[PDB]
Write an enzyme that holds these catalytic residues in place. Structure first.
Site, PDB file in Angstrom:
ATOM      1  N   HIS A 249      31.697  -4.792   0.727  1.00  0.00           N
ATOM      2  CA  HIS A 249      31.397  -6.238   0.857  1.00  0.00           C
ATOM      3  C   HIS A 249      31.042  -6.867  -0.199  1.00  0.00           C
TER       4      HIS A 249
ATOM      5  N   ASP B 243      29.058  -9.213  -1.296  1.00  0.00           N
ATOM      6  CA  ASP B 243      27.284  -9.368  -1.375  1.00  0.00           C
ATOM      7  C   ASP B 243      26.925  -7.921  -1.773  1.00  0.00           C
ATOM      8  N   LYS B 244      27.351  -6.794  -0.869  1.00  0.00           N
ATOM      9  CA  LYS B 244      26.667  -5.575  -1.261  1.00  0.00           C
ATOM     10  C   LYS B 244      27.131  -5.023  -2.533  1.00  0.00           C
TER      11      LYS B 244
ATOM     12  N   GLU C  52      20.196 -10.229 -11.273  1.00  0.00           N
ATOM     13  CA  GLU C  52      21.038 -10.958 -10.469  1.00  0.00           C
ATOM     14  C   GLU C  52      22.637 -10.641 -10.550  1.00  0.00           C
TER      15      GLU C  52
ATOM     16  N   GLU D 166      16.650 -11.645 -16.241  1.00  0.00           N
ATOM     17  CA  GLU D 166      15.762 -11.167 -17.226  1.00  0.00           C
ATOM     18  C   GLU D 166      15.499  -9.923 -17.151  1.00  0.00           C
TER      19      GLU D 166
ATOM     20  N   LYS E 150      32.920  -4.851   7.771  1.00  0.00           N
ATOM     21  CA  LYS E 150      31.404  -5.041   8.673  1.00  0.00           C
ATOM     22  C   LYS E 150      31.399  -4.576   9.873  1.00  0.00           C
TER      23      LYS E 150
ATOM     24  N   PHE F  51      43.541  -7.902   8.147  1.00  0.00           N
ATOM     25  CA  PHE F  51      42.173  -7.793   6.965  1.00  0.00           C
ATOM     26  C   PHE F  51      42.944  -7.172   5.895  1.00  0.00           C
TER      27      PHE F  51
ATOM     28  N   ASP G  85      35.929 -13.912  -0.747  1.00  0.00           N
ATOM     29  CA  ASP G  85      34.727 -14.228  -0.265  1.00  0.00           C
ATOM     30  C   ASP G  85      33.816 -14.092  -1.467  1.00  0.00           C
ATOM     31  N   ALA G  86      33.006 -14.966  -2.028  1.00  0.00           N
ATOM     32  CA  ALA G  86      32.143 -14.803  -3.142  1.00  0.00           C
ATOM     33  C   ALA G  86      30.954 -13.892  -2.563  1.00  0.00           C
TER      34      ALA G  86
ATOM     35  N   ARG H 188      21.751 -11.190  -0.768  1.00  0.00           N
ATOM     36  CA  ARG H 188      22.215 -12.184   0.431  1.00  0.00           C
ATOM     37  C   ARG H 188      22.635 -11.108   1.616  1.00  0.00           C
ATOM     38  N   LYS H 189      22.114  -9.897   1.688  1.00  0.00           N
ATOM     39  CA  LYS H 189      22.152  -9.024   2.927  1.00  0.00           C
ATOM     40  C   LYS H 189      20.734  -8.751   3.213  1.00  0.00           C
TER      41      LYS H 189
ATOM     42  N   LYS I 116      15.565  -5.566  -8.784  1.00  0.00           N
ATOM     43  CA  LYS I 116      14.157  -5.787  -9.207  1.00  0.00           C
ATOM     44  C   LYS I 116      13.316  -4.337  -9.242  1.00  0.00           C
TER      45      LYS I 116
ATOM     46  N   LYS J  19       8.037  -6.142  -8.814  1.00  0.00           N
ATOM     47  CA  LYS J  19       8.193  -7.073  -7.795  1.00  0.00           C
ATOM     48  C   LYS J  19       7.487  -6.765  -6.780  1.00  0.00           C
TER      49      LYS J  19
ATOM     50  N   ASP K 290       8.056  -8.257  -4.059  1.00  0.00           N
ATOM     51  CA  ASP K 290       8.768  -8.517  -2.671  1.00  0.00           C
ATOM     52  C   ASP K 290       9.410  -7.143  -2.403  1.00  0.00           C
TER      53      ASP K 290
HETATM   54  N1  EU9 Z   1      40.751 -10.896   7.634  1.00  0.00           N
HETATM   55  C1  EU9 Z   1      39.301 -10.720   7.785  1.00  0.00           C
HETATM   56  N2  EU9 Z   1      39.025 -10.161   8.934  1.00  0.00           N
HETATM   57  C2  EU9 Z   1      37.800  -9.918   9.453  1.00  0.00           C
HETATM   58  N3  EU9 Z   1      36.686  -9.996   8.381  1.00  0.00           N
HETATM   59  C3  EU9 Z   1      36.949 -10.320   7.200  1.00  0.00           C
HETATM   60  C4  EU9 Z   1      38.239 -10.734   6.688  1.00  0.00           C
HETATM   61  N4  EU9 Z   1      38.347 -11.379   5.505  1.00  0.00           N
HETATM   62  C5  EU9 Z   1      37.178 -11.133   5.103  1.00  0.00           C
HETATM   63  N5  EU9 Z   1      36.167 -10.648   6.040  1.00  0.00           N
HETATM   64  C6  EU9 Z   1      34.929 -10.425   6.000  1.00  0.00           C
HETATM   65  O1  EU9 Z   1      34.179 -11.533   6.369  1.00  0.00           O
HETATM   66  C7  EU9 Z   1      33.034 -11.722   5.186  1.00  0.00           C
HETATM   67  C8  EU9 Z   1      32.733 -13.273   5.052  1.00  0.00           C
HETATM   68  S1  EU9 Z   1      33.800 -14.163   4.898  1.00  0.00           S
HETATM   69  C9  EU9 Z   1      32.703 -15.727   4.673  1.00  0.00           C
HETATM   70  C10 EU9 Z   1      33.956 -17.061   4.891  1.00  0.00           C
HETATM   71  C11 EU9 Z   1      33.819 -17.754   3.619  1.00  0.00           C
HETATM   72  N6  EU9 Z   1      33.594 -17.445   2.219  1.00  0.00           N
HETATM   73  C12 EU9 Z   1      34.927 -18.963   3.806  1.00  0.00           C
HETATM   74  O2  EU9 Z   1      35.319 -19.663   2.693  1.00  0.00           O
HETATM   75  O3  EU9 Z   1      35.295 -19.330   4.939  1.00  0.00           O
HETATM   76  C13 EU9 Z   1      34.638 -14.580   6.566  1.00  0.00           C
HETATM   77  C14 EU9 Z   1      35.665 -14.298   7.220  1.00  0.00           C
HETATM   78  C15 EU9 Z   1      35.733 -13.328   8.628  1.00  0.00           C
HETATM   79  C16 EU9 Z   1      36.763 -12.712   9.322  1.00  0.00           C
HETATM   80  C17 EU9 Z   1      37.870 -13.386   8.964  1.00  0.00           C
HETATM   81  C18 EU9 Z   1      38.121 -13.965   7.570  1.00  0.00           C
HETATM   82  C19 EU9 Z   1      36.955 -14.411   6.860  1.00  0.00           C
HETATM   83  N7  EU9 Z   1      37.515 -15.160   5.840  1.00  0.00           N
HETATM   84  O4  EU9 Z   1      38.930 -14.968   5.413  1.00  0.00           O
HETATM   85  O5  EU9 Z   1      36.499 -15.850   5.019  1.00  0.00           O
HETATM   86  C20 EU9 Z   1      34.001 -11.080   3.809  1.00  0.00           C
HETATM   87  O6  EU9 Z   1      32.884 -10.966   2.891  1.00  0.00           O
HETATM   88  C21 EU9 Z   1      34.674  -9.927   4.420  1.00  0.00           C
HETATM   89  O7  EU9 Z   1      33.640  -8.667   4.727  1.00  0.00           O
HETATM   90  N1  EU9 Z   2       3.723 -19.517 -15.331  1.00  0.00           N
HETATM   91  C1  EU9 Z   2       4.092 -19.617 -13.894  1.00  0.00           C
HETATM   92  N2  EU9 Z   2       3.204 -19.761 -13.125  1.00  0.00           N
HETATM   93  C2  EU9 Z   2       3.268 -19.655 -11.669  1.00  0.00           C
HETATM   94  N3  EU9 Z   2       4.492 -19.425 -11.127  1.00  0.00           N
HETATM   95  C3  EU9 Z   2       5.737 -19.492 -11.989  1.00  0.00           C
HETATM   96  C4  EU9 Z   2       5.424 -19.513 -13.278  1.00  0.00           C
HETATM   97  N4  EU9 Z   2       6.562 -19.373 -13.859  1.00  0.00           N
HETATM   98  C5  EU9 Z   2       7.537 -19.224 -12.709  1.00  0.00           C
HETATM   99  N5  EU9 Z   2       6.941 -19.354 -11.715  1.00  0.00           N
HETATM  100  C6  EU9 Z   2       7.471 -19.365 -10.394  1.00  0.00           C
HETATM  101  O1  EU9 Z   2       7.763 -18.035  -9.844  1.00  0.00           O
HETATM  102  C7  EU9 Z   2       9.144 -18.068  -9.499  1.00  0.00           C
HETATM  103  C8  EU9 Z   2       9.771 -16.562  -9.473  1.00  0.00           C
HETATM  104  S1  EU9 Z   2       9.432 -15.637 -10.987  1.00  0.00           S
HETATM  105  C9  EU9 Z   2      10.446 -14.414 -10.677  1.00  0.00           C
HETATM  106  C10 EU9 Z   2      10.093 -13.208 -11.620  1.00  0.00           C
HETATM  107  C11 EU9 Z   2      11.513 -12.608 -12.322  1.00  0.00           C
HETATM  108  N6  EU9 Z   2      12.508 -13.381 -12.650  1.00  0.00           N
HETATM  109  C12 EU9 Z   2      10.905 -11.881 -13.622  1.00  0.00           C
HETATM  110  O2  EU9 Z   2      11.876 -11.741 -14.312  1.00  0.00           O
HETATM  111  O3  EU9 Z   2       9.727 -11.157 -13.475  1.00  0.00           O
HETATM  112  C13 EU9 Z   2       7.742 -15.097 -10.891  1.00  0.00           C
HETATM  113  C14 EU9 Z   2       6.445 -15.476 -11.812  1.00  0.00           C
HETATM  114  C15 EU9 Z   2       5.406 -15.847 -10.860  1.00  0.00           C
HETATM  115  C16 EU9 Z   2       4.323 -16.501 -11.536  1.00  0.00           C
HETATM  116  C17 EU9 Z   2       4.240 -16.270 -12.800  1.00  0.00           C
HETATM  117  C18 EU9 Z   2       5.321 -16.211 -13.684  1.00  0.00           C
HETATM  118  C19 EU9 Z   2       6.616 -15.402 -13.307  1.00  0.00           C
HETATM  119  N7  EU9 Z   2       7.611 -15.397 -13.906  1.00  0.00           N
HETATM  120  O4  EU9 Z   2       7.484 -16.006 -15.371  1.00  0.00           O
HETATM  121  O5  EU9 Z   2       8.555 -14.785 -13.595  1.00  0.00           O
HETATM  122  C20 EU9 Z   2       9.919 -18.900 -10.376  1.00  0.00           C
HETATM  123  O6  EU9 Z   2      11.154 -19.540 -10.007  1.00  0.00           O
HETATM  124  C21 EU9 Z   2       8.806 -20.120 -10.456  1.00  0.00           C
HETATM  125  O7  EU9 Z   2       9.073 -20.819  -9.276  1.00  0.00           O
HETATM  126 MG    MG Z   3      28.137 -13.662   1.892  1.00  0.00          MG
END
Ligand code: EU9
Ligand code: EU9
Ligand code: MG
Ligand code: MG
Lengths: 381, 381
Positions: free
Chosen positions: A14, A16-17, A42, A55, A164, A233, A241-242, A247-248, A268, A272, A274
């Protein structure tokens, strides 16, 4: 007092995965050479390209491009017709150094790197101490992946990487204890070559996947089986699909049971919270259920940036606590045994080890691998 | 039984939320010319760039780069020292047509476009029928953004676009009814110019934001107020931390309360049931609580791709149902009144209208805007 509830899973291919797995391939590559690496990697993808961005502060010397290509190759994206070709795709690298933003500190003193909250959940529904819905959806995708990637024949030459599944279970609730009654609906959508048709697919999936991983005593003649119900499919992966890292999060975690704080795991390093906070929170929830103290358990931890001790901790056992235990005493028992300061966290769970690639498909939780210390429960009393 | 529980929010200049807002600014640009637009617009960002990618089938003629830049300008990223400059950043567009993959259908017959599950939640804690923790964190970020962007006298010349907040509330639970007792910890981290001191920041944030939106009868001399506790926060936005669409789904929704099915909202038109199903699910939960039928309510709906009626629907009221009601009866009442078929969904909630940019910061739910029909409850009995 019966109800229906659904969870889903996705295959390794998939989009995203795919990004989660690249993100953690790169994290592992850094960690193998530099266990102290700071990684926030990312990944995104669309037609003909992957981009890794974020980063990294490391001493490791990692050929990121090579890692990307290899990871794509192992998942099976080796042609444009399947949705992506690791040989031809563009790889864009935009990785910089972690933001700049003195006093000597012990491991206990190390502050959380961010604010946030994370949850852990466990339930006695399954031996994995996971919700049955999630277990079954994840089993179906994991078996498809295994049979396609490290299988044994052209018993599956026709299967492509994307797909899926979604499992609906009918439950009874007796005193807050969830007791699965039957599997209600099983949906699987799998990507396939041109030269196979949907009837053959159903047969294969029912017999070699569904019936292999779903218990026969939970299925009956009313269980609804849907296979590729929207039709063909053949077009899939990034081409259709991007994909993006992170995103999972629900597939990664409890399938709609429990809760989530919002943070993604993949890409991460363990500073982190999280990731590391959610892993410890799972251990706590699983320990409590494993110990017989309740049947289900939800744990919330939250942190403040630059602060070592969590701002808060929360336990809910949904009324299922054992006689003479309650959520107040369980919190007091937890605070005696477990330590959520992030420096202690990381050391306790051995989270500088390059083990993360295995977690980035199949779910982070309910996993049997010996390297996942957050799934090895502690006896509490 | 007392407990602590935290929720968070982020400012509209947070790199992830910047991407949500670009995604929905492009969605609305399309809809305003072509209400039948199919949009799946993803955004990411790192130092010096924005990339927009995904699938769009539309008759609209949209200048994508101009929409990106205008959206960044309005959020306030107008210099490299703030972490992004709309005037100099690269904007890369990689959008394609939606995938291929027919007989005459009525609106009622239109199949869901994907599988997945969606949750709605409501609680009588606040007048918005939202959890207090989420309401307060979101109030703090929204007020910061308002004062920086839409107020703006040199009185806030020093505030930069990035920031986050987190609120921890101490609750009592009775019979599943949550009663807030006090605010326990308020944390805010805001980005600022070089020439202001962390000491002046506290005073401003405490007096002009915190005390403005947090009820004084929930604050006491023990409430812990943490402002920029990790240190200075001058470097921020994309420069410090990569952003992606769909990485704030819990900020977008219930703050760790209730549940999530996993799907993001921003960048997607209403034929993505991840957005439209969650919005209907919110309407249902909110109508049930508003009608006095319970104090708290979770709804799950689940879909199959290609299929018009949901595979499952689930209501849980946490034991708070009014006399004479239970979750079985409530499900029967819901099925009498509401229709979750996606073509019907969209038409009852007017989801082809270009209203989505307003949703992409500040939360999707608990919102008062007249254009959000999923926040206007139905009386049920
Ligand atoms: N033909 C298909 N049949 C069933 N699942 C699919 C199919 N094509 C993609 N998917 C799965 O769906 C996920 C999200 S796809 C997210 C949709 C979106 N990016 C869009 O632009 O509409 C959804 C989808 C589901 C079922 C049929 C077709 C689609 N599609 O063409 O977008 C995508 O990442 C695949 O794992
Ligand atoms: N100096 C800061 N103080 C507090 N929050 C911040 C600061 N700089 C960024 N953030 C906020 O944290 C969010 C996630 S930042 C995500 C971490 C990650 N991309 C990394 O590389 O470590 C985390 C952060 C938190 C607190 C201090 C500093 C950091 N940092 O520099 O990575 C980021 O999107 C901001 O909204
Ligand atoms: Mg997705
Ligand atoms: Mg983020």
């Amino acid at each position: 007092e019966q109800f229906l509830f659904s969870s889903e899973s996705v295959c390794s291919g998939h989009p995203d995965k795919l990004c989660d797995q690249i993100s953690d391939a790169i994290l592992d590559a850094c960690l193998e050479q530099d266990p102290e690496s700071f990684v926030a990697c990312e990944t995104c993808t669309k037609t003909g390209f992957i981009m890794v961005f974020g980063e990294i502060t490391t001493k490791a010397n990692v050929n990121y491009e090579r890692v990307v290509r290899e990871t794509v190759k192992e998942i099976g994206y080796d042609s444009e017709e399947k949705g992506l070709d690791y040989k031809t795709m563009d790889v864009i690298i935009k990785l910089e150094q972690q933001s700049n933003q003195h006093v000597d500190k012990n491991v206990e003193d190390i502050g959380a790197g961010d604010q946030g909250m994370m949850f852990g959940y466990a339930t006695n529904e399954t031996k994995e101490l996971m919700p049955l819905t999630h277990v079954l959806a994840t089993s179906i995708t994991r078996e498809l992946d295994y049979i396609r990637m490290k299988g044994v024949s052209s018993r599956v030459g026709w299967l492509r990487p994307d797909g899926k599944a979604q499992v609906t279970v009918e439950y009874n609730c007796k005193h807050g204890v969830l007791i699965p009654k039957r599997i209600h609906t099983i949906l699987v959508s799998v990507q396939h070559d041109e030269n196979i048709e949907n009837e053959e697919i159903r047969e294969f999936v029912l017999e070699n996947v569904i019936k292999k991983v779903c218990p026969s005593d939970l299925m009956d003649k009313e269980t609804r089986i849907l296979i590729n119900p929207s039709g063909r499919f053949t077009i899939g992966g990034p081409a259709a699909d991007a994909g993006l890292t992170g995103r999972k999060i629900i597939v990664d975690t409890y399938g709609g049971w429990g809760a989530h704080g919002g943070g993604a795991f993949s890409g991460k390093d363990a500073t982190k919270v999280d990731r590391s906070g959610a892993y410890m929170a799972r251990l706590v929830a699983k320990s409590i259920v494993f110990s017989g103290l309740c049947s289900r358990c939800l744990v919330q931890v939250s942190y403040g940036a630059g602060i070592a001790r969590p701002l808060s901790l929360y336990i809910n056992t949904f009324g299922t606590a054992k006689d003479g235990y309650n959520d107040t005493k369980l919190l007091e028992i937890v605070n005696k045994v477990f330590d959520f300061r992030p420096g202690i966290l990381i050391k306790q769970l051995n989270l500088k080890s390059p083990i993360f690639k295995k977690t980035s498909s199949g779910g982070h939780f309910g996993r049997s691998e010996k390297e996942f210390l957050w799934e090895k429960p502690i006896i509490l009393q």
